[PDB]
């Protein structure tokens, strides 16, 4: 507003406001010196405390997210993209440019480099590069099918249907499952040197076949083979898919182009820390009379020295200015030492706050000076006095208890020694126990006898690499010589499996070189499918790290900007926990980097976010239902976007009257979207998704993750006990999406609207040759799910949580909790309602050979899982700092080894299994072995 005049429906497009302003300027003086309208830009303050301009004509004033009705008149794409990023992360971006912490700005400058290499690799082989990006293959973990269960194929060949749309001809062809799509297309041409490489989208969803590999190993074709369904494929040319994406490029932001030895081993002093005062501690004065501060030089869960405590003082004024000496030498400190501190209260032993102060910094310089840090609140249900596994760094929130400290003054340069001095330190200065400990689970007990055997025969541990997580819990990290030797070991340690290495990223291995080795092994040997399966854990290991930058984000961000599905799930996993302020800053910076380098896909996310935003608002008014939801806003918003559950499911035109909501205590959104595919008829007419709000879903995601892992292992070994690990994804604070499967019914509905009711229903569903197959499939599913629900200790369930398919499969939902809530191993109880079905209606069950086959197949599945339980142990260990009250500390993972009976032997575990399920059923178990 160069003239400064202000005048005050108007929620239309900005053209109306521009015309009104021009009319006012023509009606009043001082407008003679105004320049061309194209040289003036409308800028104002949005609801997110950001000065931003407005070039978007498609969205009106009401979509600008303004808080007050005012407008001012003053590269463009740069801050347009900045506004888009701010929308895509839900919080203002430029608000981080005012942070006075040099670590934040250093990370912001440095992560853009990683974004640059990621997008450069994303645009390495144009135009095919971002083509493979935008729709990445959904392959299976196993490249090759098992050699002994390919008999499901008729003469080792699979029949498929290829469709051509002319605006609709199908071609049914039989091909070997280990054949590349080249021959698929070559023989598709016939029946109606030509090196065609055109896309074959799954009819009804955006899965595409690009790899020069066989057709069977895709997660969709394999499902069709195992389920017996007819695989239908439809042919496009390259031009349509290439013209679908209008191309995008990454640009450098504003802060992009802007540009002997002395060490810590030559100090002879003691780690003495001056605790000056706490600015304010939120503890009652008369109620609590004895408080103090506990500090420990932790390294993992290990207090390197005894936690030195301060004197107890009245709560009137907590000023000490007191030097506390810790029984630890300065040069013996490790690179990852952490002053874990907490104000605590004693009566006559419970903390009042907690916090961690790094004993170094990202510049590898020892902490030194006057240092006032705020403290986090006590985590829920954490009985331990300290929190060595908690988040690192400062508390960004300001209205929290703040402690003042002073650190020793040396008037020199403090730096942890370079690897060179340790490297050239030299040149101038039976196996039964090893195998038993290596094969033993990581959570197990350890003794100093075997610890000393490990340390003494460390040179023999290289032949057995899986022992690497065993040495670390053995060595004492407060000794420069032993730690130097361990660094030398880590440097030349051979890589281990992407699950054993993935064990080396827990909350118990904080050494920067150890976690660097673990992340290097991950990026070297983890596969895109395995990365997709374990992305939840790989995001949960960010919170354990000390600094904003680390080798972990260097890998996660590089992968999430090369695979659009992996990147989409990385986006949603990050964004799902913005509410937790502990890692809000770190993940918001990572989110800004992603949203800057994601590309055009950004707006897709925005659409998705927008939709969920509406739903989050819509689900907010749900606490006589369709008439209220009639504004064109949500028809315009809730259409034509990829689902978060799948970057391939276009949630198309909504059928408002079709979607109805039942009570079921809490009220989700059973929302059905039509499929906008030209021939969505073959796969599904519809796409139904349950939108849950108010309940957490991370534990359900983990449950489905481990269920799919178990099912894949069972398929690999030779037990065709097919599970139903459907899709689920939490999108924020206790809100998410759940898939709904095809042709499935809960047992309670059958009983209510239909005691042999289940048997009668399974009988009347089908007749003839497709009967015995139904009973066989029901047997397999029940056995697999019973073994699963016993091993993981899934809590109380009713008939409602159980559904049965038409073909015969049975499956479970509504995992309220698992691994118990502490203050009854298998209280689920298998009722005889299924026992009559498995016996084919016979009253007797003992004299049935089918029940014997069921029992032995259950036993084989259980003993198959018990020999792979190490992977599950590591998986449970990784997500400890993930915030679930049932996955806090390692003592909650014993439920995995208790039920799997890892302490006992195979046979003893067997009788434990039969005893448990015998106590469950009041009889009918503990039969003859084999």
């Amino acid at each position: 507003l160069p003239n400064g005049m202000i005048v005050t429906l108007r929620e239309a497009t900005l053209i109306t406001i521009k015309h009104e302003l021009f009319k006012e300027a023509r009606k009043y003086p001082l407008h003679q010196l105004l320049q061309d309208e194209s040289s003036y830009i409308f800028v104002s303050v949005t609801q997110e405390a950001e000065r931003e301009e407005f070039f978007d004509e498609t969205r009106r004033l009401c979509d600008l997210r303004l808080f007050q009705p005012f407008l001012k008149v003053i590269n463009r794409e740069e801050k347009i993209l900045n506004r888009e990023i701010g929308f895509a992360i839900g919080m203002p971006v430029c608000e981080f440019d005012m942070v006075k912490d040099p670590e934040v700005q250093d990370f912001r400058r440095n992560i853009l480099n990683v974004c640059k290499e990621a997008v450069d690799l994303r645009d390495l082989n144009s135009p095919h590069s971002r083509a493979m990006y935008v729709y990445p293959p959904n392959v299976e973990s196993s490249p090759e099918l098992p050699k002994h269960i390919y008999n499901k194929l008729d003469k080792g060949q699979i029949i498929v249907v290829i469709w051509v749309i002319v605006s609709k001809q199908k071609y049914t062809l039989k091909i070997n499952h280990d054949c590349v799509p080249e021959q698929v297309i070559a023989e598709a041409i016939r029946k109606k040197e030509y090196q065609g490489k055109y896309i074959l989208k799954v009819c009804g969803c955006d899965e595409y076949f690009l790899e020069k590999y066989p057709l069977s190993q895709y997660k969709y074709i394999r499902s069709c083979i195992m389920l017996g369904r007819m695989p239908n494929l439809m042919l496009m040319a390259k031009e349509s898919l290439y013209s679908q994406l209008p191309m995008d490029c990454f640009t450098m932001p504003s802060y992009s182009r802007r540009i002997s030895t002395k060490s810590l081993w030559v100090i002879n002093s003691a780690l003495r820390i001056k605790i000056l005062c706490a600015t304010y501690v939120n503890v009652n004065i008369r109620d609590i009379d004895k408080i103090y501060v506990r500090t420990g030089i932790y390294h993992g869960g290990e207090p390197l020295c005894d936690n030195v405590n301060t004197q107890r003082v009245p709560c009137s004024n907590p000023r000490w200015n007191e030097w506390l000496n810790y029984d630890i030498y300065i040069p013996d400190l490790p690179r990852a030492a952490r002053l874990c501190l907490s104000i605590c209260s004693v009566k006559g032993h419970c903390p009042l706050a907690w916090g961690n102060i790094n004993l170094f910094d990202y510049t590898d310089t020892l902490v030194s000076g006057k240092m006032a840090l705020n403290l986090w609140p006590v985590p829920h249900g954490l009985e331990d006095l300290l929190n060595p596994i908690g988040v690192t760094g400062s508390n960004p929130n300001k209205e929290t208890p703040c402690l003042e400290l002073e650190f020793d003054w040396f008037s020199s340069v403090v730096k942890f020694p370079d690897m060179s001095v340790i490297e050239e330190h030299a040149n101038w200065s039976d196996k039964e126990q090893l195998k038993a400990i290596s094969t033993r689970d990581p959570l197990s007990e350890i003794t100093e006898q075997e610890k000393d055997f490990l340390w003494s025969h460390r040179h023999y541990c290289v032949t057995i690499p899986e022992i690497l997580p065993k040495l670390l819990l053995s060595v004492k990290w407060n000794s420069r010589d032993e730690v130097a030797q361990m660094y030398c070991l880590v440097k030349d340690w051979p890589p281990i499996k992407p699950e054993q290495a993935m064990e080396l990223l827990d909350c118990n291995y904080p050494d920067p070189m150890v976690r660097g080795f673990a992340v290097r092994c991950l990026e070297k040997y983890l596969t895109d499918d395995k990365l997709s399966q374990y992305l939840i854990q790989l995001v949960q290991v960010l919170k354990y790290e000390q600094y904003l930058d680390n080798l972990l984000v260097r890998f996660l961000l590089k992968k999430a900007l090369t695979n659009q599905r992996i990147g989409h799930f990385f986006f949603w996993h990050l964004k799902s926990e913005m509410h937790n302020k502990t890692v809000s800053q770190r993940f918001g910076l990572l989110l800004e980097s992603y949203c800057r380098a994601c590309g055009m896909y950004l707006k897709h996310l925005n659409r998705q976010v927008e939709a969920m935003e509406k739903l989050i608002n819509l689900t907010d008014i749900l606490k006589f239902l369709v008439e209220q939801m009639r504004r064109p806003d949500f028809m315009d918003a809730l259409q034509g976007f990829l689902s978060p559950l799948n970057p391939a499911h276009q949630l198309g035109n909504l059928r408002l009257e079709e979607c109805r909501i039942m009570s079921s205590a809490k009220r989700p959104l059973w929302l059905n979207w039509e499929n906008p595919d030209i021939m969505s008829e073959l796969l599904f007419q519809n796409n139904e998704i349950i939108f849950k709000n108010g309940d957490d879903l991370r534990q359900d995601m983990l449950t489905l993750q481990i269920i799919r892992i178990m099912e894949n292992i069972w398929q690999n070994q030779g037990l065709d006990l097919r599970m139903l690990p459907y899709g689920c994804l939490s999108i924020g604070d206790c809100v998410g999406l759940i898939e709904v499967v095809r042709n499935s019914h809960t047992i309670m509905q059958i009983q209510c609207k239909g005691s042999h009711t289940l048997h009668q229903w399974l009988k009347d569903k089908n007749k003839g040759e497709i009967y015995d197959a139904a009973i066989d499939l029901f047997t397999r599913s029940c056995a697999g799910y019973c073994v699963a629900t016993f091993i993981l200790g899934i809590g109380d369930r009713h008939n409602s949580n159980i559904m049965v398919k038409d073909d015969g499969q049975l499956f479970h939902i509504d995992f309220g909790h698992f691994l118990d809530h502490k203050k009854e191993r298998v209280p689920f109880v298998l009722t005889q309602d299924f026992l009559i079905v498995i016996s084919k209606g016979a009253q007797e069950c003992t004299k049935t050979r089918e029940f014997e086959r069921f029992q032995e197949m259950c036993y084989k599945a259980y003993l198959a899982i018990r020999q792979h339980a190490n992977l599950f142990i590591n998986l449970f260990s990784m997500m400890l700092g993930s915030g679930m009250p049932e996955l806090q500390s390692f003592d909650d993972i014993a439920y995995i080894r208790k039920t799997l009976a890892l302490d006992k032997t195979e046979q003893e575990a067997l009788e434990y299994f039969m005893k448990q399920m015998n106590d469950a059923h009041h009889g009918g178990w503990t039969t003859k072995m084999d």
């Binding site: 400064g4 202000i6 405390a49 808080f67 020295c305 007990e445 509410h579 302490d903």
Partner: protein, 236 residues
Amino acid sequence: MSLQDAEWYWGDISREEVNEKLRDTADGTFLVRDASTKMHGDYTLTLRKGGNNKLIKIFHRDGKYGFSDPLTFSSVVELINHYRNESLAQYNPKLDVKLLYPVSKYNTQFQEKSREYDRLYEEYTRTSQEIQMKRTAIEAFNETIKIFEEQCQTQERYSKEYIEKFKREGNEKEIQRIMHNYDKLKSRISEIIDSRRRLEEDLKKQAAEYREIDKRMNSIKPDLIQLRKTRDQYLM
């Protein structure tokens, strides 16, 4: 001198109880529990030192108990007393510790306290989000007040010459319109300032409530911890 009468003997006990009892205790605390493997009674001692707990296993061969070869100790109690009254550095100097303190032997409240703990946690996590939102709103109001003030300053700096020329020419309707606009702007600024002051007062009250809520949580949590400890002691 019998296993059952020994105070350090604890039988088949999982690590949860061992590590729960080995807390809020001085260095040099020990107890003996049956080995988890449960084969011919290997037994196992615990040894806290430097915070960390070290697990010791008492090997048994040819009717004889000892830490390791050579095997020259008859019973477990003999070795336990021998290393209770003598340092452990004779074989491995690293341990170099003396056994001083032994582990000596000696309902709706829990569920209720957990219920208020959960409800206070939920209230706290909602209050933190609403406090962040209010802080962002106040920051936005301050920023927009600053932007309005600087826009007014630059408007005056750019239009002072023309205003002076117009007022010296002899015109009066321009003076009236400037007075009207100035009064409207001043009223708007006063309203915004009053709203910001009221919002700041509300934020102060809400921060006081937040402090009180966290103080309640931190005062209540030790009671729940003690009740859980009592229930665990009574049941297991």
